[PDB]
From Swiss-Prot, chains A, B:
Disulfide bonds join C3-C47, C104-C153, C115-C136, C137-C140. This is Non-structural protein 1. It is found in: Secreted; Host endoplasmic reticulum membrane. It comes from Japanese encephalitis virus (strain SA-14). N-glycosylated. The excreted form is glycosylated and this is required for efficient secretion of the protein from infected cells. Involved in immune evasion, pathogenesis and viral replication. Once cleaved off the polyprotein, is targeted to three destinations: the viral replication cycle, the plasma membrane and the extracellular compartment. Essential for viral replication. Required for formation of the replication complex and recruitment of other non-structural proteins to the ER-derived membrane structures. Excreted as a hexameric lipoparticle that plays a role against host immune response. Antagonizing the complement function. Binds to the host macrophages and dendritic cells. The chain holds residues 971 to 1148 of 3432 of the full protein.
Amino acid sequence: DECDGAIIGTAVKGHVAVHSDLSYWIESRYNDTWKLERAVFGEVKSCTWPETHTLWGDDVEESELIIPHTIAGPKSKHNRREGYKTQNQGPWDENGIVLDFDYCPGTKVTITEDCSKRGPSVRTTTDSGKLITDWCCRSCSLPPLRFRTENGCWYGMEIRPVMHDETTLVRSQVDAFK
Amino acid sequence: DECDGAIIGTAVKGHVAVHSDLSYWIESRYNDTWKLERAVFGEVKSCTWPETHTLWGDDVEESELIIPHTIAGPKSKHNRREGYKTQNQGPWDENGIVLDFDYCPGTKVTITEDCSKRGPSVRTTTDSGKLITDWCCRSCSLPPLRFRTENGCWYGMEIRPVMHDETTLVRSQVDAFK
């Protein structure tokens, strides 16, 4: 069950590339390497993005694909960022999501092996609304992988909160690999 | 110069409607009335949304159209919210914008005629990064018209900041009617 290809536009012109359809707009850009810049989502859908409308699809590790292939993430090397594996436990259950690489307001991220492994995405505001200001990751690149939803700012799976008192965490309840 | 219609999908099914193309996803919804809910933008473009792909286009005041018609805002009564006129001075010069109706984090809006008229959109963080916490509007509906861009949270033209000390304001430098 491929996503319908009649309604897909994919283009690269020099050093910007877009994979787009009626709900997704996925931009990658070349600085020194090619990398995923930002992605905008009307609504998340479960289908497979057709190879006919996929740039740079030779020899693709699906684990490297930031937007999971099960939710119409293109099976493209444009869909990558150094230091991040597929974000299957992002906050995908929301609507109107933006994915980019930038700090959540008020937060700070440190690259250090004194950090827990990948988990579900965590929102930057506690269950009662307090800001979690410090974050870490084992080997993720900066600036950090960011999701914005209507209700909050969330980090990629790699990036874990740093807490020193008892805190309730809001975490993505969904998995794109079910 | 109409936007290309080959690449447009517009549908309404019961009480949800979407106007969509390769960069825009515009959702309206019926609760008691029909109103614009949210809109997601890969990139802003200057063209006219064709009537062939426009619901509820009989007898339309272009001043009521939240997304200006000059930037491919559909000329549709779905593209409306009570208490708001067209947002021609929104922060349209950014990329990956989301428009919805919700409070900017940490802010509060009061409906009162002790308030200045419509102006350019104002970001909620001052030029040096301080949060402007209080806002007002003459006759706008709540929850308030919100833009989110990469860099900040912005309010609709109707909604003005409330300040009691000297402050530098970041304001949209663009006009969709040039």
